[PDB]
Amino acid sequence: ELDFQSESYKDAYSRINAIVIEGEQEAFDNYNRLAEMLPDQRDELHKLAKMEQRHMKGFMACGKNLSVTPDMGFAQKFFERLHENFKAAAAEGKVVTCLLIQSLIIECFAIAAYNIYIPVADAFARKITEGVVRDEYLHRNFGEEWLKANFDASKAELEEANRQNLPLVWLMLNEVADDARELGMERESLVEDFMIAYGEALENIGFTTREIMRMSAYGLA
Amino acid sequence: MFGLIGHLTSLEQARDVSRRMGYDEYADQGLEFWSSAPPQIVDEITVTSATGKVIHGRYIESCFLPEMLAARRFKTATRKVLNAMSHAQKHGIDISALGGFTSIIFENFDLASLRQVRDTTLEFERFTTGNTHTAYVICRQVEAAAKTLGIDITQATVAVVGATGDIGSAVCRWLDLKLGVGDLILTARNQERLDNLQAELGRGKILPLEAALPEADFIVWVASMPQGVVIDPATLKQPCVLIDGGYPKNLGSKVQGEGIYVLNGGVVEHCFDIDWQIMSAAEMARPERQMFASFAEAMLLEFEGWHTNFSWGRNQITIEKMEAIGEASVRHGFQPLALAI
Ligand SMILES: CCCCCCCCCCCCCCCCCC(=O)SCCNC(=O)CCNC(=O)[C@H](O)C(C)(C)COP(=O)(O)OP(=O)(O)OC[C@H]1O[C@@H](n2cnc3c(N)ncnc32)[C@H](O)[C@@H]1OP(=O)(O)O
Ligand SMILES: [Fe+2]
Ligand SMILES: [Fe+2]
């Protein structure tokens, strides 16, 4: 690499740039819709939802940095299963499942993807992402503490919500596997950093180590 | 709070240990799963000293397997070492031992350069290789098996397989000054490092592994082999004493014949039962009492309060430190493993 030399790199960066900005976009509205569901923190959620909007602006600026055309059409079927499971769960008033999809599953996915990106990325893009990662780590802390205070009522639904959505993530990385290699990211390394971020969340929320192993493990991965 | 960071011998053992722990899903997996697995605290340890002090520890599974080195996954092997060290810091463990190959990888791949892991700066004063204590127990094991079998150590030939190593270099200085060994044979891969070890000691002949075995009364194995070799007893002298301190065993077969005495080297035995399940898998002769010496160093540092990187680097062990750590080892209830009979 060492050169965002095009015709290999620009083909692949097109999908990845579309995926990251959509996830930023999909995270942005996602965060606010909890404000209905959760009364007290409704102003905290808007702020955090804003952070996602500039994050998206900034990764759009990474589209300015290079002559790259994104495509949301491939990018939105990527989140289709993840989106629909959030859409349905919010309609039923299941706040506990809702926090898991966004605050834990999506942010750990962001954390992992940004940390692996930092070293390999184009010099200009490196600056912009190194700033974004410490926000995401706070994002995660929002769900961590809420579920911590509501552990005993939320535990049984948290287990259920993990079994259905965590497999999606295994599958999602495999679709992107060959693209991420083009940019100097290994598929294996991405999975490792998601598990570390995810297992750090679960442990603080209150799960014991034995539970954590079974739960992290879902998906044939 | 001391830490024990560790790994398994083989994918087969990972399969069995996974199912013994109850996770049937984990045992199904190939090398790829273990190459992306995160570190776990899988066991909590309480130990009582012979002085009566009580200390508490944790065991971290790194998820390294030596197969990864043969399969040229140096990228992966390094992550596993750094995630495990990072993991033990996040949990506020005051001193941790880098068991097995984790200490090897740390030196061999200049991981002191990469101390920023996930943005958390690794405080090297929170880790030890455990190698100082391992070198002592091996020297005490050679002395002890010499008397058990009626051998006069001071007129005997001892080969050190891995003599330029961290442990191997230390064993050679102790076998030189503290026990006055007859002859010293030096075996290794690199030649420059062997030449300076002969210059430091002022003694010892350098031979390959093929030529050193038939001329050795004592064979001390302390080499970083991923696999482990097949030795035929006809190549060896009678009697022959093999001390195999490697992980995995540098002896890929149980070498048995008339005059062949095999001791599992680098092991110590505590005087009180220990609350744990981990040494059960490690094939310890008595798993509630016995353990590896480098794990015992972490307990020793914790009993004494020497929160520091007591063993570090390579070729830095001195006799003064081996003596210190050995004093503390005896005083707290630990004894070298002896010949089985
Ligand atoms: C979702 C998650 C799923 C989780 C599920 C899993 C849950 C289950 C986990 C529960 C597990 C419970 C079991 C716990 C495991 C217990 C075991 C402990 O972990 S670990 C056990 C604790 N650890 C132990 O066992 C400690 C004992 N072991 C040791 O002390 C060390 O490993 C050592 C002695 C072997 C290394 O020595 P050291 O000095 O440190 O190494 P150096 O590099 O300095 O030395 C290198 C020199 O060696 C020479 N050399 C190399 N190759 C050759 C050759 N072919 N010919 C000749 N010579 C050779 C060579 O010359 C070289 O220099 P050069 O000439 O090459 O330059
Ligand atoms: Fe974001
Ligand atoms: Fe976010």
Residue numbers in the entry:
A (entry chain B): 9 to 229
B (entry chain A): 1 to 341
Sentences from the paper on this structure:
The earlier discovery of the pathway responsible for alkane biosynthesis in cyanobacteria allowed the conversion from solar energy to alkanes through photosynthesis, without providing external carbon sources. This two-step pathway utilizes two water-soluble enzymes, namely acyl-acyl carrier protein (acyl-ACP) reductase (AAR) and aldehyde-deformylating oxygenase (ADO). AAR catalyzes the first step of this pathway, reducing the substrate fatty acyl-ACP/fatty acyl-coenzyme A (acyl-CoA) into the corresponding aldehyde in a NADPH-dependent manner. Subsequently, ADO catalyzes the conversion of fatty aldehyde into alk(a/e)ne with one carbon shorter (Cn-1 hydrocarbon) and the formate as a C1-derived form. Here we report the crystal structure of AAR from Synechococcus elongatus PCC 7942 (SeAAR) in its apo form (AARapo), together with three structures of AAR in complex with ADO from the same species of cyanobacteria (SeADO), in which AAR binds either substrate or substrate/cofactor.
We obtained the AARstearoyl-CoA–ADO structure using the AAR C294S mutant, which avoid spontaneous formation of the acyl-enzyme intermediate, and solved the structure at 3.01 Å resolution. In this structure, the entire stearoyl-CoA molecule occupies the long L-shaped channel of AAR. The CoA moiety occupies the same cleft in which NADPH was observed to bind in the AARNADPH–ADO structure. The main cause of this shift is that the C294S mutant is not able to form a thioester bond, and thus fails to fix the stearic chain at the active site of AAR. This extended conformation of stearoyl-CoA induces movement of the Fr-I region of AAR. Thus, Y23 and Y26, which form the terminal end of the acyl-tunnel in the AARthioester–ADO structure, are distant from the stearic moiety in the AARstearoyl-CoA–ADO structure. These changes result in a wider opening at the surface of the AAR molecule. Furthermore, M21, Y23, and Y26 of AAR form additional hydrogen bonds with R218 and M221 from helix 8 of ADO, and the conformation of M221 of ADO alters so that it no longer seals the acyl-tunnel of AAR as it does in the AARthioester–ADO structure. Together, these structural changes facilitate the release of produced aldehydes from AAR, suggesting that the AARstearoyl-CoA–ADO structure mimics the aldehyde-releasing state of AAR, in which the free aldehyde is released, ready to be transferred to ADO.
